[PDB]
Design a protein around this ligand. Sequence first.
Ligand SMILES: OC1(c2ccc(Cl)cc2)CCN(CCCC2(c3ccc(F)cc3)SCCS2)CC1
Ligand SMILES: OC1(c2ccc(Cl)cc2)CCN(CCCC2(c3ccc(F)cc3)SCCS2)CC1
Ligand SMILES: [Cl-]
Ligand SMILES: [Cl-]
Lengths: 99, 99
Amino acid sequence: PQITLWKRPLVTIRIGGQLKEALLDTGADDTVLEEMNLPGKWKPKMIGGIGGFIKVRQYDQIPVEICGHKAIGTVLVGPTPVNIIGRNLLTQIGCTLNF
Amino acid sequence: PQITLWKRPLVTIRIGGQLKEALLDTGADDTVLEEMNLPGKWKPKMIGGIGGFIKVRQYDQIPVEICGHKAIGTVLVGPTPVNIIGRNLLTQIGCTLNF
Ligand SMILES: OC1(c2ccc(Cl)cc2)CCN(CCCC2(c3ccc(F)cc3)SCCS2)CC1
Ligand SMILES: OC1(c2ccc(Cl)cc2)CCN(CCCC2(c3ccc(F)cc3)SCCS2)CC1
Ligand SMILES: [Cl-]
Ligand SMILES: [Cl-]
């Protein structure tokens, strides 16, 4: 698709057979999702954003379907204000910025 | 141009006669720039990101040139390590997400 940006680029993703709304965010390096329980061993990780550092659990090789497109990659879970799909998965679905 | 997301989408912008680099950020509603002195009146705002809130100063009708494209709009100035171009200016230069 072509998504214009007069509205937030909020998309339905499915992960763990859960449907969630997430923002397509070219300014985020990583995908970070609101607290949820995923099967698997996780690494604790601290990540920094503008208001400060948050503590997240790192899950690798998680399958995620984003607007009908499959991706397999790291998901960081923790206290983000919104579900954010960052560049590690936007690259996998072939996403580019155009102007 | 078409920008892939293998790396951070940093582009060159010009404000005043200052040459700066900035992150193209589809998840940001607002443009937030590093601490600088701009013309006109401003009002404080609190904006929250990952990690919490920062206080910024709001300037309206600032001309910003981003990859040779002219935009004019509100800019929030605050303590950020990166200049972030949000959706309010991204629509002005006709930028879209595509996959
Ligand atoms: O869109 C945001 C946002 C959107 C919506 C909501 Cl509700 C909250 C935040 C999330 C990302 N930040 C920009 C962070 C830029 C830096 C960075 C990039 C990626 C990363 F994972 C960590 C840091 S680049 C160098 C230091 S910060 C703006 C607001
Ligand atoms: O533009 C922001 C910004 C710009 C630049 C920088 Cl550096 C930081 C932030 C500051 C304002 N928020 C407003 C929306 C916040 C909430 C929300 C998020 C996403 C969504 F899809 C719907 C609602 S999150 C929970 C309730 S509204 C977005 C990022
Ligand atoms: Cl942030
Ligand atoms: Cl926010």
